[PDB]
Structures are given as structure tokens and as C-alpha cells.
Design a protein around this ligand. Sequence first.
Ligand SMILES: COc1cccc([C@@H](C)NCCCc2ccccc2Cl)c1
Ligand SMILES: [Ca+2]
Ligand SMILES: [Ca+2]
Lengths: 281, 51, 51
Amino acid sequence: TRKGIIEGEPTCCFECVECPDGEYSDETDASACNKCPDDFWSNENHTSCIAKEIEFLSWTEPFGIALTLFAVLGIFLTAFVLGVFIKFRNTPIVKATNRELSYLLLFSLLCCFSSSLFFIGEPQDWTCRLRQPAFGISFVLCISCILVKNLQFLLVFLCTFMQIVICVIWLYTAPPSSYRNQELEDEIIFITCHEGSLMALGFLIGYTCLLAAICFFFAFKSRKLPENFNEAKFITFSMLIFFIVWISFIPAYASTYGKFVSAVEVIAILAASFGLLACIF
Amino acid sequence: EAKFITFSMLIFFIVWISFIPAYASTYGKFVSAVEVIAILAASFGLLACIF
Amino acid sequence: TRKGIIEGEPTCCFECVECPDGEYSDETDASACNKCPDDFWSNENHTSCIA
Ligand SMILES: COc1cccc([C@@H](C)NCCCc2ccccc2Cl)c1
Ligand SMILES: [Ca+2]
Ligand SMILES: [Ca+2]
């Protein structure tokens, strides 16, 4: 507490007044309350300084363990599919479905599933730098590989090179960085990332969504050919799932406040990937 | 009508799974906004898929 | 703002300390800041409280 003034009476007479939040009194007969040191907050008794709680999406939360379980299951399923394809090689269907392109697609799907682990845990600097470009490049490679499905590799590498060059331009000009946000609550510090260049993120998302749209159009144009077990139908379905996932992702990200924002991405990515894999494999 | 029922169920499930995090950590009008959006999306998906 | 004791000095000598949030003072030469009523809150200038 701190000493008050009964106006009209001498200085030897005072009244004790409670020190407010963000202030404390650690001395007998104090006149003013000291402000807490930065990254510290007054306790309930207003006499000492507890540490401000650091908040992020941890691995101990049930949400984190659930997302990790789903990601590991996706990785296992992709590896299982790749092993089955490589074991039953030189067979009619596998050789009919462009073995090499299928292997590249499965590797890129493994990359897509592994790229979701950068959005979980305390965000360090390199994780914030590698969060978006990994998924962007991997999914662009996936989409191009499906679209193409030698000359094929030359065709497939160009879109990935475009994505790589825009990503490296982004990282050279203004890279993201970690941020210890202190505005959302006076007793909690939220550790997040911060995309330095919004234009690069928008361009990356738009390029991916344009490739998806082109693939969807070419799949719907040929939705009745029965070649290769009628893969056009399932490519159409995969593109539809992708578009639904991201169109529903927009409001989910817009409405979320706090750490759980990261969660939504770890959801959306996974969902999209899963759909794709199933419909094609 | 197998395809349409399956797609409607997918729309419903994807919408709610995506909106779970927003429901877990939000207080205010955005809760009602999420409710209305998730109801309208499901109803529109069902109608469009079926009829 | 409110009066603040300077230790070892007579009552006529004091300091001016700004009132914190949720409390206000609407007079000159104030000793203790008041408390805004229920459903009110002090303004930025802390000269009154609005609903
Ligand atoms: C086309 O689909 C994608 C292509 C690249 C990245 C992604 C996901 C992983 N992040 C979206 C970025 C969402 C966003 C928008 C504005 C401000 C901050 C943020 Cl964080 C999706
Ligand atoms: Ca007197
Ligand atoms: Ca004296």
C-alpha cells in the first residue's frame, strides 16, 4: 500500500491506499508505488513481480498432440503408398501411370505433410522464415506434377523455379521475424511471427490458386475419358476439395484471435494434402 | 445420388473442422458470425448438392 | 491528477501524480481520485467517466 493525505492534517497523519495493478509496494510507509520491471507484472497481493506468461502453440497442449498425430499419420500413409508403388513396379497400372512422375508427386506430398510442423511450437527466427515458402513450393510442385501427368521434367521445373525466385526475392528484400507481441493482454506476451512483405505472400498464394484453377479447368474439360482408370474425375474432385478448403480457411483465419490462429493453418494444409493424396493414389 | 450426399457431408465436416479454432478462442460478435456462417454454408451446400 | 506526499516536507509541498484507469478527478487540488460508478469508465484525460 501507499500513504495518502487527509487534507488539512499534518504530514504525520496518512491513510493507506491500495497499489493498483502494474504497481507494488515492497517497503513500510511508502509514498508512491513502483512500476514493475519490463516483462514482469504485479501479483495479486501487489508486493512482488511475477514473470509475464509467454504464450504460443505448444507441444503439450491437446491440440498440438492431435495435430502431430495427424501429420505423422499422413507421413506414414504417403510412405506406405510409395513403398507399394516401388515394390510392385514393372506392372501394367504402375507403368501406365508414369512411375517417375508418381514418385516425384509422392516425395512432394511428403514435403507438404512435413511443412506443417513449422506452425507448431515456439516460433524462432528460422522457423518464421521457412514457414510459408516450404508449403508454397511443395504444393506448387504437387500441382504441376499432377497437371503434367525429359520433356515432362522440363515442363514441371519451370513453375517451381518461378515460385523459388519469388520466394528468394521475398527473403532478400524483407524477411519475416519473430515478435513478442504485448498488446493483447497486460499479463501475457504472445510469441508470433511477422510477415515482413505482404505483397510476396499475396503473390505466392495467388500463383498457387491460379495453378490450381488451371488444373481444375483442364480436368473438367476431359472429365469423361476413361484412360488410366479415369483419373480426370478424381483430379477434378481434388481441385474442388482444395478450393473448398481455402475458401473456408479465409473466415476461419479472419475470426481467430490468439495462438490458435497457427492451428487453423496446420488444419487447412493437412486437409488439402489428404484430399489430394487420396483422390490420386 | 451418392456423389452429392458425399460432397455435402464433406462440405459440412470441412466447414466445422475449420471453424473449431475460431470457436475455441473468441468472445464477442464473432461467435455469432461464425455460427451464422457455418449454418448458411451447410444449408447452401446441402441444397446445391441435392437439387 | 492527485496530490502526492514528499517525505520530510510540510503538507504545503507535494507532487502531482496522474490518476490510473478506472478512477478520475474532476477538481483542482485533489487528494484522492474517485471511482467511476457501475457501468462507467474513466476517459483518457481522466477528468470524468463515460458509460
Ligand atoms: C494457396 O494456398 C497457400 C499458399 C501459400 C501459403 C498458404 C498458407 C500456409 N498461409 C496463408 C497466409 C495467411 C495470411 C494472410 C494474411 C496475413 C497473414 C497470413 Cl498468415 C496457403
Ligand atoms: Ca489545520
Ligand atoms: Ca522536515
